[PDB]
Amino acid sequence: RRFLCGVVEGFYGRPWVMEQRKELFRRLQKWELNTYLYAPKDDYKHRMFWREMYSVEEAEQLMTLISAAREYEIEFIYAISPGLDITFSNPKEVSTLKRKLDQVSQFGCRSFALLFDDIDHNMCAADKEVFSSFAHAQVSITNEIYQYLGEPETFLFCPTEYCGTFCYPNVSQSPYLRTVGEKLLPGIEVLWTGPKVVSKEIPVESIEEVSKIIKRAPVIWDNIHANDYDQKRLFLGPYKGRSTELIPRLKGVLTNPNCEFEANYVAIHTLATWYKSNMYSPQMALKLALTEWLQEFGVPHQYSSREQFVPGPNEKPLYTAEPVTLEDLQLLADLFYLPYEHGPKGAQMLREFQWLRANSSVVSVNCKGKDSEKIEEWRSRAAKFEEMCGLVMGMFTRLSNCANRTILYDMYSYVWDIKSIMSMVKSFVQWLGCRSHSSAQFLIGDQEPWAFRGGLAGEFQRLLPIDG
């Protein structure tokens, strides 16, 4: 039995380059994965201008990538998304699609996919006179393409209603999915993403409900680590929340990685472990992933003596950089954990800070003669919070000195922002702790840099509704 496991390059943003993709292939082979799907959202010749043909230089790029994929025995799937403006009743459109796919095949590509995600539900007047339904036209054109291509072993189709939230009135009773299942040829595999676009968890019953319609096992398009619906968020947590009992009931798992190329080591490693387990413990998987990931940070750059000055007792020490530790990586993971939850350490820090803020007025000003136990407890908790903030700042400082700065420079902004905000919060906590003998306003320097926050974004965020 064959099974699909791999990655889908289908995020919005600056697309990855050839070197990154080759390194990705090497990692995929190391981790015993087998599938790469190429459907970048911002490739003009993929979605927006699919009708155009590739040039000689683009042809060389594609041929090099496909040959590299063949070297590492990783299946390469090329996708097309003509749903933006294709007319189904015009033979010229079908011929153009056939010619495009033939140009792709000429390079040596083997597997092809057609996507109709994120388009409208309407058709032109011409198609109304031919097809009874939108699904009818989609299925007819997909079947024609599949027959033309020679019935390859692998072929992927994404229904417009790729999630339950987009099915009306429900998954079981949707006429679109019923028509698809009735009229789609048996040789095509169907993509699905779960109850929601970003599914927090996937119960088996929903997958069975989908199977009862599509008459085949689906292929999971998991956006558990996608970050193109709010690009301020980075996700480094392990693959979590999907039950392994789905493995016999699925044709394959394909993961959407983070837009930043070097931030997807942990997610892909955890996915590989998750699949390999049952041909599972999210905490153990994360621990193993970080243990393996630490090896690629190497050592911090150090002065190389490979006649050198050596200081004495009265001379300033030479600058030295500490190595990056496992604890730093764990803390970094907890700071950027999951789309629907934080890590244990980040959540605990947030709760502790909220508690400290809540009871600041208990002992802040002129608290002599009050309960000493409250004063000591508040001071101790504040000190522990200070230690946590110092740990975060030290993590950033140590990561800054890594010799292999490629890892950091692809995620520099997020870590720098989180360490800056931790520093600001530490200053705020100190000012709260000094109220009884200092009446000065909370200030960093002589002013309030936090008032500006993130400019317009932050000022608009400040006005959004909250639970409290």
From Swiss-Prot:
Mutation effect (residue 12 to K/Q): Strongly reduces affinity for glycopeptide substrates. Nearly abolishes enzyme activity
Family recorded in the similarity comment: Belongs to the glycosyl hydrolase 84 family.
Subunit structure as annotated in this protein's UniProt entry: Monomer. Interacts with CLOCK.
Effect of residue 117 to A: Nearly abolishes enzyme activity
One MF annotation (Gene Ontology) recorded for this entry: identical protein binding
Expression by tissue: Ubiquitous. Shows highest expression in the brain, placenta and pancreas.
Location of the GH84 domain: 3-279
Record bears the keyword Ion transport: no
Gene Ontology CC: cytosol; membrane; nucleus
Organism from which the protein derives: Homo sapiens
Keyword Nucleus on entry: yes
Name under which the protein is recorded: Protein O-GlcNAcase
Domain of life: Eukaryota
Name of encoding gene: OGA
Residues annotated as the enzyme's active site: 118
Outcome recorded upon mutating residue 450 to N: Nearly abolishes enzyme activity
Substitution effect: residue 118 to A: Nearly abolishes enzyme activity
Disulfide bonds: none
Catalytic activity of the protein: 3-O-(N-acetyl-beta-D-glucosaminyl)-L-seryl-[protein] + H2O = N-acetyl-D-glucosamine + L-seryl-[protein]; 3-O-(N-acetyl-beta-D-glucosaminyl)-L-threonyl-[protein] + H2O = L-threonyl-[protein] + N-acetyl-D-glucosamine
pH dependence of this protein's activity: Optimum pH is 5.7-7.
Binding residues for a protein: 10, 41, 117-118, 162, 228, 256
Regulation affecting activity: Inhibited by N-acetylglucosamine and not N-acetylgalactosamine.
PTM per Swiss-Prot/TrEMBL: Proteolytically cleaved by caspase-3 during apoptosis. The fragments interact with each other; cleavage does not decrease enzyme activity.
Enzyme nomenclature, EC number: 3.2.1.169
Keywords for the protein's UniProt record, in alphabetical order: Cytoplasm, Glycosidase, Host-virus interaction, Hydrolase, Nucleus, Phosphoprotein
One annotated GO biological process: glycoprotein catabolic process
